[PDB]
Design a protein around this ligand. Structure first.
Ligand SMILES: COC(=O)c1cc(O)c2cc(NC(=O)NCCCCNC(=N)NCC[C@H]3O[C@@H](n4cnc5c(N)ncnc54)[C@H](O)[C@@H]3O)ccc2c1
Ligand SMILES: COC(=O)c1cc(O)c2cc(NC(=O)NCCCCNC(=N)NCC[C@H]3O[C@@H](n4cnc5c(N)ncnc54)[C@H](O)[C@@H]3O)ccc2c1
Ligand SMILES: COC(=O)c1cc(O)c2cc(NC(=O)NCCCCNC(=N)NCC[C@H]3O[C@@H](n4cnc5c(N)ncnc54)[C@H](O)[C@@H]3O)ccc2c1
Ligand SMILES: COC(=O)c1cc(O)c2cc(NC(=O)NCCCCNC(=N)NCC[C@H]3O[C@@H](n4cnc5c(N)ncnc54)[C@H](O)[C@@H]3O)ccc2c1
Lengths: 342, 343, 343, 343
């Protein structure tokens, strides 16, 4: 009956919260120094946004952001967490002698009761490609607990798209699919499945990093203002794009990354997963075209990236792109729920 | 159905989604030991298939059914519960075998077969042989087997042996000691160190390793698929008494398995032992919480108890002791959540 | 009509003899020092096979082999050539003061008149893969002028086949065809032609050289004895093969090269185009499989290479190969008339 | 037919075999200047195609017919004489355009068209514009053109200019001097040196080059395809009077061409000039066998005479003189046998 369960299949949720119940996954996220250090800087350098304030930490995990809020002077922090990690967060609150200031509240943020409205919401809601996990909907849902002029850390998110050329990545995924081109694998003709194999492989977003030299145009930016967005905004995300090509060659797909900003009273602090910046546990994401497009420097590559949220806490991706000057058109569907970790 | 009574829905959804991918089929088909040995077992025992009725349990892409067709089978019922069943259909059509291979979507515990069969073929083995609890579906399928029908594979041998791997043992604490710092960005994490150690030690380690870490001849626990019942696999008690061949510290038990295709013409073996080329089953190792010192000639005795759970896997309870000294160790592990260490 | 024209399309012959009418092509063949030096050695070191003998030079071109025969003491050499190069040969015979000994006879060797029978035939009848050009049939046809005791230089030819692995060559030809995979080339769906494009590209034998590292088994040898063969023997050439694989991996096709032997009275001299030998203007030839075959070291790769002569002075190639242990079968057709020059 | 009267069978067979290959279509399609400019010319002049009847002469894969369809043509007759016609048919089906594009196999001089057309489109240009004598087929097709009708391309400009390239000139003799040796394996080849020089100089050099080798503003010879008759192209006389911008030795004449698509909305140009990005037409250079010294301000005058031959090409006769000194040079070249020097 909760907003969460209406939009989420049980089996997806079971797996999701089992995964985040493990201390090893917490360690993996916490040891990303860019991630953890930038969150600490954003909070501590904006200490006036926390001094004597009431805070909500959405999906707190081990509790680390709540401890930063306490270091910054927060009067009271409600730390909401739906996995079994909530019990471990409690252990740390006791052992850091902060029971008077951090209150763990087990459950889904769409389902728990909070005793009061809060001045500021903090969270790490970003998934791969920003939107994976559909955790941004829970962060926005939590605004029901935000006082009128309250703040959100992070405050905004920028998704960046850019066209890329990477023949080796293309031929790797292409070579895999041509396994099913074989007419006599131990005497068995597999070729009738070649098309279905190519489809399956090229639907997989490629999660890994890459040199910026593969980017063929300045990135296009789609911005979510978390102070203003509603959950429903994220069920169907339409991102138009028009790229002015800076290099001639084959376009093998689009690359995705994101930035978020903590717009504080004292300063704005940015956390970037761009390929120009040190690697993070978010890496970067690339959606391959099944057939590359040829473009000349100075051509425009235009189209639309459509993200449709699904009940597996992820998105179906539709990318339609064309070279305006020639009319070369490519349409592509990808399943962010089955990424290829390269 | 028998399947749903013993399986959580959420476990089954994930399980069959995973096997719905062609890439996972390709990963299994590319294992030359796995695919080549199944082909040899069937083709070299052609009299067990000529003009016979066959059941392929969990046929995936259909590959074992095609081998049965190459061997002269009159009719093959290929049962598959994932969406891979539709791809198997495509291949049957394109290999012009619709008159001989019938794909039947669904669980073998739930579908109807028109006919009793002469031989069941399947690949029911998981990690440590028993993971996935697919062996129960393979045995369940015997309700369709004619009296004196055969099973391919016919038996399975799970092998246990003690191992020494100081680096693997110490790696657990190096990972857990992440939590043993008093000011991680100002936060004392040390209260969680013990919980982290516990969590790493509950995970069996899927990996391969050099046979020089093995400290005694393996002990063998055998399932004869012609004779076993599903119920035999709900509680699997494997006693062991190891005569130690080397002195040193024993850090846990290593697992692998063999299966045999006992045909009329010959018996063909498929081995995942560490003395053999690697397979997609690798090997499995379960650590003790505290190592045991043993001398060459001592005996290390105890039991490995595998208790089936509703997550298509087993809870593993290992108790071991050095008889000559009384040094005792145990561990509890969740086979459903293995740690993939191979690189 | 003559034997040549009944087996040859006019349009093929016009082009063929126009090509050989050019001095630049003569230079290209003559500057191959292996080719020219070995022909000279074969003749001069077997001088007794030429001293005071009557010689026929089939397809003499510029006349070089006739001049070697004259250096070796031949009484008379009939130099037959069907291209306009016959007129340049004439010039050289007069400029080298050998008119009393070398008699150029313009025309096809299947059509000209020789005044007498000869003691020995010399020629360079080898094309790419030995058989291209169907010049070997003209060389054998010329035996009608050979005395009972007569000899032939070259005397025999060995064609060698061996399996090879060359992922980069395969992906190169494969990448070219996938141009026609495009669903919107300037708005035009080309993909319905993809299959026809792959066929066309993989029908092309690849002429170039390569490191012997890529060979996966000892070569198999097919021998033509020019003293004994008849023209008809070369209309349908069937080369069985059974390779014992020395390395595991993908087999992307078969590699071809040849040797010829000049079996003289004094010694036998060999001319090899093997990839273990210095490059010649014959290079080597490779026939790709559209789908490579996986084989293990110790497997056997067996099948047949079938060469069917066509009216374009070349051969349709059929290669059927299978990995005996798995039954993986590959069938391939190639047009030797349309080679891909990669060097 | 008009085609067979003017074309030797053997030339045509080879010509249409070459264009039968998808790889040659792909090579022409990948030339972005060629394909992009044709697309722009048609699409930007859409009013010349909307609901119109179109004839595509020598359509190959059909690409220009698809551009005409993108531009709204009611009906397109796509004529192609090679086997590529069958592949065009496949693409028309798979692009769901059978109601609008009709592929007609055969020579445009021999096929029937059911009706007159509003506009003819073709790519009739060969090297130096005229090679292949395809322009005569394009003009021949005007019998199907309505009185009002247009042609895409509408005109062609051939450009000639004098060039200096000492290294290109000397390269001829370096190659020929292979023959100038008195004992090549004992054989005096030198009598053929002059024949070799002649043969190299008869070949037009297909290559690109830096515009700084040009020594005078080009002279332009124009063919208006709306007005020319086939017979106009049997004997093409191009007078020239160059006003030399640089002093030096003139080693020959360089050739290139432009065509214009004169539409109702705009005129679009396709240039193969050396100042423009390279195309698969490159540029062509015809050497003089003796260079001419000229000073800046001198005039180099003469005639380039192109005589069509039955090999779908031209015999080229260039006669040039420096008016101020009387220094004359002649040259006879065969456009059918170009030398491809580009690397
Ligand atoms: C086999 O292939 C596949 O199927 C697959 C697909 C993937 O994509 C895979 C991806 C992986 N790794 C990955 O993504 N790493 C990068 C993580 C970026 C940072 N994520 C982050 N902090 N988000 C929020 C999380 C925290 O918020 C809590 N929470 C959520 N909702 C809540 C609610 N309603 N109330 C309260 N608490 C709630 C959670 O419990 C938790 O503590 C691994 C494996 C993958 C496998
Ligand atoms: C996040 O951590 C985790 O949670 C986790 C845990 C693991 O352990 C993970 C392990 C993996 N890899 C692995 O295991 N590799 C080794 C494979 C060995 C060979 N397996 C085999 N052939 N067995 C049988 C399967 C076939 O039988 C069908 N079938 C089953 N019942 C049926 C029924 N009732 N009717 C009809 N058809 C039925 C299935 O649909 C399928 O076609 C990867 C990821 C893993 C993740
Ligand atoms: C893809 O595009 C394509 O279509 C193509 C296909 C090719 O394959 C291409 C191949 C090329 N080059 C090549 O292969 N070079 C290496 C071979 C040299 C060694 N061969 C050799 N000496 N044979 C004998 C030749 C001499 O014997 C004469 N002759 C023949 N019969 C006669 C008769 N009945 N009476 C009298 N005289 C006769 C001839 O006139 C001549 O003087 C180039 C371009 C190619 C193009
Ligand atoms: C033997 O080896 C050597 O010595 C040689 C000599 C050369 O010179 C060599 C030259 C080459 N390369 C080259 O020339 N590149 C320049 C690009 C030209 C671009 N223009 C273009 N596409 N031509 C238009 C023709 C198209 O119209 C069709 N058609 C013709 N008439 C038709 C009719 N009556 N009805 C119907 N259809 C007809 C044809 O089938 C075809 O589709 C390569 C290799 C060469 C080799």
């Amino acid at each position: 009956r909760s907003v969460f369960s209406e939009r989420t299949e049980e089996s997806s949720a079971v797996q999701y919260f089992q995964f985040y119940g493990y201390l090893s996954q917490q360690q993996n996220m916490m040891q990303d120094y860019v991630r953890t250090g930038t969150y600490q800087r954003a909070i501590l350098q904006n200490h006036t946004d926390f001094k004597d304030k009431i805070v909500l930490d959405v999906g707190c995990g081990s509790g680390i952001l709540s401890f930063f809020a306490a270091q910054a002077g927060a009067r009271k922090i409600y730390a909401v967490e739906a996995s079994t990690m909530a019990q471990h967060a409690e252990v740390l609150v006791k052992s850091n002698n902060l029971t008077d200031r951090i209150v763990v509240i087990p459950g889904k943020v769409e389902e728990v009761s909070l005793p009061e409205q809060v001045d500021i919401i903090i969270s790490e809601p970003m998934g791969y490609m920003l939107f994976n996990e559909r955790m941004l909907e829970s962060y926005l849902h939590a605004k029901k607990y935000l006082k009128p002029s309250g703040n959100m850390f992070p405050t905004i998110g920028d998704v960046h798209l850019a066209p890329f050329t990477d023949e080796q990545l293309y031929m790797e995924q292409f070579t895999k699919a041509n396994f099913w081109y074989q007419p006599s694998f131990h005497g068995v003709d597999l070729s009738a499945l070649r098309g279905a194999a190519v489809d399956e492989y090229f639907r997989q977003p490629v999660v890994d990093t890459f040199d910026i030299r593969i980017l063929m145009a300045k990135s296009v930016k789609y911005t979510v203002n978390f102070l203003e967005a509603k959950e429903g905004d994220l069920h169907r995300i339409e991102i138009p794009f028009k790229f002015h090509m800076l290099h001639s060659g084959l376009v093998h797909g689009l690359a995705f990354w994101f930035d978020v900003a903590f717009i504080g009273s004292i300063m704005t602090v940015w956390l970037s997963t761009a390929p120009t910046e040190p690697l993070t546990h978010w890496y970067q994401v690339r959606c391959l075209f099944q057939s590359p497009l040829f473009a000349k420097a100075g051509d425009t590559l235009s189209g639309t990236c459509l993200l449709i949220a699904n009940k597996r806490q992820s998105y179906d991706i539709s990318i339609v792109a064309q070279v305006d000057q020639t009319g070369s058109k490519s349409s592509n569907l990808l399943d962010l729920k089955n990424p290829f970790f390269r």
